[PDB]
């Protein structure tokens, strides 16, 4: 009956999956895409105790197993398609010119978003439409909002990540949560960390929900402890014994351990809308302390930000409070952590977009403006990852679709600063394309993106608290 | 926990080696191995490294593509490769082991080589 | 880029007396610098490391210590089987080079 977005939605990826994939034309050391491939390649000839050990300079194996093992599947599927593309050493830098095994992977992209992405984010519309009782409408309309999130459908296609399976894993995460299936939503959470270890920052959340739920909340229970003690156990067993049991043991554990957390290196070099990458520009941290005081500094950061709401979680658990609290703690991480990339704003929009299915107008209006700026922060790598018109495709398409043309808050203050930002990043989009900078420090638009991002996510997670402490009271839950 | 080296004689300039370091008792995955040489009668400097998890090797700036360090965690051993060795190279050669932590928090060079005296003579 | 001024070139005192070696630094963007000591024939030895922490297997009249860029070494109670050279070392960070002192000799003042 409605099932016509669960159609323009896939039109709308595969359209966009035709894109340059990120390093093109790069001779000496290619972009991810070349990432990707290289890691299917290299999974399917060598013994499971060489995965991580075979070249540590070139794309070496750097995701929980769960990257290894999916990569090594659709590894083998391409293999049967064709094997020639996959020559060990040799196809180390595939170009072909009729488009072969792009197409491929874009379908593997695709594919892997139907079976993760989808299904969870409408299930949950679908569940809570059910509970707050709307018009059939509006819940597919509050569905085609959120599968049209533009920032997310760019960074898989054409840039070539699959951020999207964690996600959706969270997602169920998220339901299984709501429908309190606690066991399966503790397992669907240590799933989605194996994916990618970057979704360890709802573990600050999930730890003490679930805690309060089982352990304290209603009753001072103790079953259902043992339960998820036995289930998350279970999980990190079952996804790490091929590595421990058919491969090198505890060498290749510790060597997988700290091949996912590696050491820090550098400081300050890459230009995110952080905390620091700021106010390095003022203060010139390289100077001022040593490298540890940095790295003591920014945990104690990260770790005063989502302090608080973990412990209003641990005080008031209630299902109607979750997005939020996510929001907290996501923002808590990727604003104040030491070496934060281009990306990873992703997975605060997580917990950001599922806020679609609210019913106030301020919220709805907060949420688009935001999902507008992230997009707006990831411009520089797309314009060096090609992408000329495809950002302003989707940017365009996003806003017209969700109704922003009869549109702000009912607050004059919000009003001028969406407004005020607005004309930022439309002024921005010129100082670059026609101006050169001052030649004294050439990148400086770049930072002048650092900037500009950084008060709009300061200013949101601000709010997100204020959100959290100003409700509490006890609220129909319906909202 | 001791280090052994191997490979050392004279060598005309030109020439080639590949000195070998074998460990006792400590994974060679998690030392970050260095090659400090020393002079005749002079101060100690280094010459090569590795970070042993993220094949990281950093070349002084006076063996740029000369030498090549290398390692292998299969039999705990590391290799230095030499393919120039001028006149002036002429030292004595130790390899170093230095366990980084978490928060880059070093732990010194704790395990030296005996060392091994190279000569680049004609 | 990298390296450190260990002052000065060459000292003399005789036992008991107590003494200071200073190593001033380049860019104070790290804080692991270790002070060895090198018999002449053998291989250094850690004295100390992180700056400040005396290694464990060496006697405590060693105290280090870390001034904004100008890292400092005292041995309070010199005794007379402790006169060698001592080499103050930096290591910016794991893939960083990294760069030994210049050398200090102790020996006996008469």
């Known amino acids: 009956p409605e099932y016509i977005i669960f159609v323009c939605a896939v039109i709308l990826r595969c359209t966009i999956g035709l894109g340059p994939y990120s390093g093109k034309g790069s001779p000496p050391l290619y972009g991810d895409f070349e990432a990707q491939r290289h890691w299917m390649e290299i999974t399917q000839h060598l013994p499971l105790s060489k995965w991580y050990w075979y070249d540590l300079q070139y794309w070496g194996l750097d995701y929980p197993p769960l990257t290894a093992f999916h990569s090594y599947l659709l590894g083998l599927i391409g293999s049967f398609f064709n094997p020639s593309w996959f020559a060990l050493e040799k196809s180390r830098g595939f170009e072909s010119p009729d488009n072969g095994l792009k197409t491929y992977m874009r379908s593997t992209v695709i594919i892997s978003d139907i079976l993760f992405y989808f299904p969870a984010v409408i299930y949950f519309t679908k569940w809570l439409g059910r509970y707050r009782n709307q018009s059939p409408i509006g819940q597919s309309i509050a569905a085609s909002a959120i599968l049209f999130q533009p920032s997310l459908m760019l960074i898989d296609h054409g840039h070539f990540q699959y951020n999207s399976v964690m996600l959706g894993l969270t997602a169920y995460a998220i339901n299984n949560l709501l429908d309190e299936y606690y066991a399966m939503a503790a397992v669907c959470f240590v799933l989605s960390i194996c994916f990618k270890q970057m979704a360890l920052y709802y573990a600050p959340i999930f730890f003490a929900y679930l805690l309060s739920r089982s352990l304290l909340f209603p009753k001072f229970n103790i079953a259902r402890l043992t339960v998820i003690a036995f289930a998350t156990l279970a999980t990190f067993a079952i996804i790490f014994a091929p590595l421990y049991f058919l491969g090198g043991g505890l060498k290749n554990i510790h060597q997988c351990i700290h091949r996912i957390f590696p050491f820090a290196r550098g400081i300050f070099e890459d230009k995110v809308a952080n905390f620091w990458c700021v106010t390095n520009v003022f203060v010139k941290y390289k100077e001022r302390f040593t490298i540890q005081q940095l790295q003591l500094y920014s945990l104690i950061a990260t770790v005063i930000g989502f302090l608080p709401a973990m412990i209003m979680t641990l005080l008031h658990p209630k299902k109607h409070l979750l997005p939020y609290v996510l929001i907290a703690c996501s923002m808590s991480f990727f604003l104040f952590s030491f070496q934060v990339h281009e990306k990873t704003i992703l997975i605060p929009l997580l917990p950001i977009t599922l806020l679609y299915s609210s019913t106030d107008w301020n919220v709805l209006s907060l949420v688009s403006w935001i999902n507008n700026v992230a997009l707006f922060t990831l411009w520089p790598l797309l314009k060096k990852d090609g992408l000329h018109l495809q950002y302003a495709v989707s940017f365009l398409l996003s806003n017209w679709l969700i109704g922003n043309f009869s549109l702000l808050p009912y607050n004059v203050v919000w009003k001028s600063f969406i407004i005020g930002t607005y004309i930022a990043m439309g002024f921005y989009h010129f100082l670059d394309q026609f101006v050169a900078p001052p030649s004294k420090y050439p990148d400086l638009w770049v930072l002048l993106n650092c900037a500009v991002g950084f008060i709009c996510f300061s200013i949101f997670w601000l709010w997100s608290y204020y959100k959290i402490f100003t409700s509490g009271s006890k609220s129909m839950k319906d909202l | 926990v001791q280090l052994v080296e191997s490979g050392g004689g004279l060598v005309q300039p030109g020439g080639s080696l590949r000195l070998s370091c074998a460990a006792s008792?400590?994974?060679?995955?998690?030392?970050?191995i260095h090659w400090v040489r020393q002079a005749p009668g002079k101060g100690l400097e280094w010459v090569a490294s590795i970070s042993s998890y993220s094949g990281y090797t950093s070349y002084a700036d006076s063996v740029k593509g000369r030498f090549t360090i290398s390692a292998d965690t299969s039999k705990n051993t590391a290799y230095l490769q030499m393919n120039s060795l001028r006149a002036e190279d002429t030292a004595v050669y130790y390899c170093?082991?230095?366990?980084?932590?978490?928060?880059?928090?070093?732990?010194?060079?704790?395990?030296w080589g005996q060392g091994t005296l190279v000569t680049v003579s004609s | 880029d990298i390296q450190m001024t260990q002052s000065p070139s060459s000292l003399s005192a005789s036992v008991g007396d107590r003494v200071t070696i200073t190593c001033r630094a380049s860019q104070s963007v790290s804080s692991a610098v270790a002070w060895y000591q090198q018999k002449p024939g053998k291989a250094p030895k850690l004295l100390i490391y992180?700056?400040?922490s005396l290694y464990s297997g060496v006697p405590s009249r060693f105290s280090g210590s870390r001034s904004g860029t100008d890292f400092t070494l005292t041995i309070s109670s010199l005794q007379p089987e402790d006169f060698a050279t001592y080499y103050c070392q930096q290591s910016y960070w794991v893939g960083y080079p990294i760069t030994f002192g210049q050398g200090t000799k102790v020996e006996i003042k008469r």
């Open positions: 170093a082991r230095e366990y980084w932590s978490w928060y880059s928090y070093s732990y010194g060079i704790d395990y």
């Open positions: 008792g400590f994974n060679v995955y998690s030392s970050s």
């Open positions: 992180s700056a400040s």
